[model samples]
Target: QTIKIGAQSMSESEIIASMQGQLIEHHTDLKTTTIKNLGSNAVQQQALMNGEIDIAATRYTGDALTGTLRMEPEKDPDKALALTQREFKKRYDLKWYDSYGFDNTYAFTVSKELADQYHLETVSDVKKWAPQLKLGVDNYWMKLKGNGYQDFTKTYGMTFGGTYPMQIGLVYDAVKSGKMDIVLAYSTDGRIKSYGLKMLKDDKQFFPPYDCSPVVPEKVLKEHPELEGIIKKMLGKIDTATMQELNYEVDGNLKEPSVVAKEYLEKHRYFE
Candidate 1:
């Protein structure tokens, strides 16, 4: 039997799901497969309910809280996790594993060069520097959905020298090349590390927690007896820095995700 996992399109999601798949195959006779690009969280949840996949390596705990659990956003990380677990179990009959020891949330990322010039360390710092700096953000974020660009700028009291709207993938390059001074980004993106950018602190908590963790359909757990032991070994194992390094190995070094996953598992010896 195959232990199937689902992944979203982002590099971090792909890497961790691949990591989970490799470790499972290492310990059990069951073959492993990770279905990539099953779309966003909502789509992936539907697929899991339909038995299209057994597992998910999902980030965006904020969405799980608001969209899945329908709760107000909170900065308390432990409370957020507890609410997610309780609601997912109650509503979807799914289970959430402990976070991978990282909160991969949204970021106000500035290049090292720009940061050094302005001593910009937190979103609030933008208040004084707004007129001198250029803002770069993805098109979707520019729409100002759910405390997006406009909300962020108004809350931080920033009006940038310019605003550039582009694909998220290209925004990192723009920032690194000095085409843009700052870009909106997710915390654990490989490009952040690759470009040597610095993330400003969200001092007032503009964005929500996006803890990346495994969410499994309970039926699969019942079917695969060895899964519990295998799953527990993975809980809280990967911290932010380690996750960033793993992503850099794939995105920056051009190593295949499967190869990176296998090598990481071999080194960590996560198998029971």
Candidate 2:
């Protein structure tokens, strides 16, 4: 028997897909396949519901809540997970598994030097340095409604010396070079670690959690009971810092996702 895993275009998603496929083949006689480079969560969700794939290698709670489930954004991580799990199971028989102990959501990041010098630990901490700090953020974030710079200023009662809109990918290096004192970055992006950046906690919970999890159609789970045990081993295992390093192994070191996944599993002895 063959189990199919769906992956998004990003390395993080692809790495998880490879991990799932590797684990299945390692423990069971069944073969596994990954449908790679799907465009978005909606695409993967549709393919899974249409019986085109057995598993979605990565699904984010924030995306599924606002995009797939058509619900309002949720700020609390636990509420987001529970709501997504309840609705997905009830509506589509999709089983949303536990998060991989990381949230790939929007985060305010700074250089390690700045964080240590200012003793900053959370978004609120930036308020003390707001007027002197220059912020680099993606254009989309500047104009986003309800959660953009406008709302951020109102909620946190702070504003930067200047907010520059640049390509999201450039923010990491921009901050690292001291061109910007802070930047908006993805929580799990490898560049944060590569550039010696620090991700500040969203203590006020302004951004909703985008906790990544693998989702399977309940039918597939029933058909292949062994898959449950294999995938469960990954739950709450790959924390944010750990995921950042794994991504760096691919994005920075130029290693193939499959090779990285294999080595990671083998290094841990399949987490046995």
Candidate 3:
């Protein structure tokens, strides 16, 4: 029984790689494929729907749009529990199982020097200094209606003189060199430490919550009922700190994703 899991080609790919060996131990023939490193959720969703991959690790935003799967909520404990039950029934047509939880949020990072120079500690500080700032954000952040950059500016009442839509690598460089005052980033991104950038408080709470979890495909459950138990066991053992440590291994130590993932799973007894 070969099962293919598709993952976004970011730090998340490393996360999945960490779980791959354990998954194989349970299924014997399970495997994974890394898709485009920066592919949008829309693209990955299509890949799932089109049978390109049996499972996918992606943002919940895409699930909201496709309506093919219902994502488990992380904010409301009761709702998250209930959704876990409902999701198995509706999406997988099997019993639901609990997995790990990670609080993922979009953040803005600036150099410590700039923060000191501007006396800035929060997103609100950016508004007063907007005219002199150059922002580095993903283009997707700019266009995605409600939860995008527009909403961020509106919530903070700030307007930037200009924005630089650079790749993740370039955005890191822009912020480090003082070429850009702020850049969009993930709260748990391992690069913050690598680049020595300071994360500003989203004091305004402008961004929505993005939690990470594994959503098993229905077919996998149908074919291998034992997989449910394996997923539950693996997920029960992971949390944000564990995820960050694994990311640090991949992003900071430059370890091969498969190797880091294997060590983490084994250390946690996930392979047992």
Candidate 4:
């Protein structure tokens, strides 16, 4: 049986999943397939639970906690990770591996033009103008209570002129296009630079640890027994800068995801 890595269509996810498939194919007897461009996070969750894909990479803890299990977050990062892992194991027969070593957390960003217009340098500055600005955020932030939009708004203590719902990926373009004035984004996304968006510092530290990691089914690991160890070789190898560089290759350089993955692995000597 082939090992399938489930990946969303975004640059970071596609790069991480491809690197996983490339390294696994090089290091193991198993051949791998990457299932890319899935419908959405909810749809992919259904696929992972049904065992359509053996492995899913680059999933965020907060997203899984609020969206996958509809649970609130623990303030401590370790406790949150553990709780999310246990929930998946008990409810979905899945395991959450160590983080890919990057937060990929939520950030409120604006176009360089808008940032300059408002004299905004930090998210703390956002609240000053928020009530009069249009805010756009993805589904996760809107749904999460303490760590999501509710807490974000309450902590920031202001309502924007409007709150628009859209995908995280699309929000980048949305902001630059004036679809919404302020939009939430993953800090490490290459499009932040590509689209000329300025990231506002989280002065209040409102967001939770949004680290990315692999979540695989118990059934898949039971057969490949060694798969976990093999994947773990990549732990701590990619950090925020490294992730942005890789995503830049796909989004900015226009390189193919698989090719970018292979190049990174070989350059980093992931294999002996």
Candidate 5:
């Protein structure tokens, strides 16, 4: 028999999927395989529900809450994770494992120089400089209803000196190039480290938490009891900083995800 793991096309998801496959292979005779470039979490969820894949290498709390569960957005991280874990198990017979200790949520990032100079550590800390900072953000989020820039300003109770709407992909380089003082970035993006950016904590918790974890069907867990311990070994192990570094190894250094995964496992000695 074989175990199949599924991942989104994104490098973060792929790297984690590869890591799961590698761990399964080395630790058991399950003959693990990975399905890469599955494109989206929705796709992976479908694969999981249909038994097309035994494990989804990465699942996000917010994504599952809003996308799959069709539930209201929860800003509190603990509540969100709890709801997702409970609902996925009850509704789909899926086991939502403990987070890898990173939430890939919308982040406000600034250059390390600016952060050091201003002693900025959280979004609330930016309030004093709000009148002088220029923000680079995606047009879609700018125009999005209920959660757009206007709502964000209201929620955070602060506004930047100027807001520049650009394609999401360009925001990282825009801030890196010093064309913008701050930019909206994904917390786990490799560019955060590559461009020497510092992510400000969301003290007000404006955005929903997208805590990352591995999802597996309850059936698989019952079939292979050893998987329980193997997966538990990674709980809260890879935090945002470590994930960013791992992503940079594949995305920035152009190494294969499999190689990156193998090296990471080797470094941890497969958590054995």
Candidate 6:
């Protein structure tokens, strides 16, 4: 049976490229497609719901109660298992595996120059400069509601009342050009090294852990019980450092994503 896997064409293109090659090796009949890159995750989820795609390589968690979608499992295993069991009873009526991959985090970054000038080396250092710093926040952070800057402030016990809000794409540039002293960044983002930005160690453990993993749709898993193994094979092979390297190869060298992925898979013996 042919399996169709969907992904975002731009942002996660490298990851998708790698998955496609690996999946095809395991199931020769597999095929792949890319939806509009703009709303990759949204499109992939919609495709799965509509039966337009057989599998989706996006982040979503199964919500046990309320039947709402979540991005990842609860940090606590006991809580997550309870939630998983509840979700299984409600939506899919099927159990999910506890194993996951793609652990990442949202990080605050500063340019090397600023890091040196302010003697900033960790999250704690930000407190001293918080008053004068102009943080470049993303749209998500600017909203000041659930899961936005408001939540961030609550967790950190700091405020950027009038910090600048810029489109997500422009943040790296803003930080690099010294237009903004700090900006939100992803731990796995390849641009950090390119722009010479430093990540503030979450020494205080402020930001919540942001891990990515597969949330298989019920129908697809029911049809292919072996799907878990296939997905796990891909995800289990990756770590934070590996992911950062993969991102670097694609974003820094402008190499074909498939080519970079193939090299990494071979180097790591993931293919064997």
Highest lDDT model number: 2
Give candidate 6 misplaced runs (Cα > 4 Å).
25-27, 36-46, 60-90, 93-100, 203-206, 268-270
Best by TM-score: 1
* Model 2 misplacement above 4 A: 72-74, 115-121, 125-134, 138-154, 157-168
C-alpha positional error of residue 105 in candidate 2 after TM-score superposition, expressed in Å: 2.6
Q: Rate the local accuracy (lDDT) of all candidates.
A: 0.80, 0.88, 0.64, 0.83, 0.86, 0.62
Model 4, stretches more than 4 Å misplaced? 111-121, 136-151, 162-167, 173-181, 193-196
Candidate 1 ranges beyond 4 A from true positions = none
Steric clash count of candidate 3: 1
Answer with 2 or 5, whichever has the higher TM-score: 2
20-106 per-residue lDDT for model 4 (tens digits): 888888888898898888766688899898878889977888778877888875656777788998999898888988788887878
Per-residue CA lDDT of model 2 for 1-272, tens digit only, reads: 67888897777988999998998898888898989878756678889999888999989998888778888878789999999999999999989998988878889999999999999999999998899989999857787664678889899999789999997767888999999999998888898877888899989888778899999988998998898999998999999888888888987889999999999999989978
Question: Candidate 6 on 82-189: residue-level lDDT in tens?
Answer: 565566447654444443354556678999999999998887788877878888876655663434677667767776535887666678888898788898877776
**4 or 6: which has the higher lDDT?**
4
> After superposition on all CA atoms, what RMSD does each candidate show versus the true structure?
2.0, 3.0, 3.6, 2.8, 3.3, 4.0
TM-score against truth, every candidate: 0.91, 0.82, 0.82, 0.85, 0.81, 0.77
Indicate the worst ten consecutive residues by lDDT in candidate 6: 59-68
- By the TM-score metric, which is better: model 4 or model 6? 4
In model 6, the clashing pairs are 64-87
Error of 5 at 112 (Å): 3.3
Q: After superposition, how far is residue 255 of candidate 1 from its true place, in Å?
A: 0.4
Question: What TM-score should be assigned to candidate 1?
Answer: 0.91
132 Cα displacement, candidate 5 (Å): 8.6
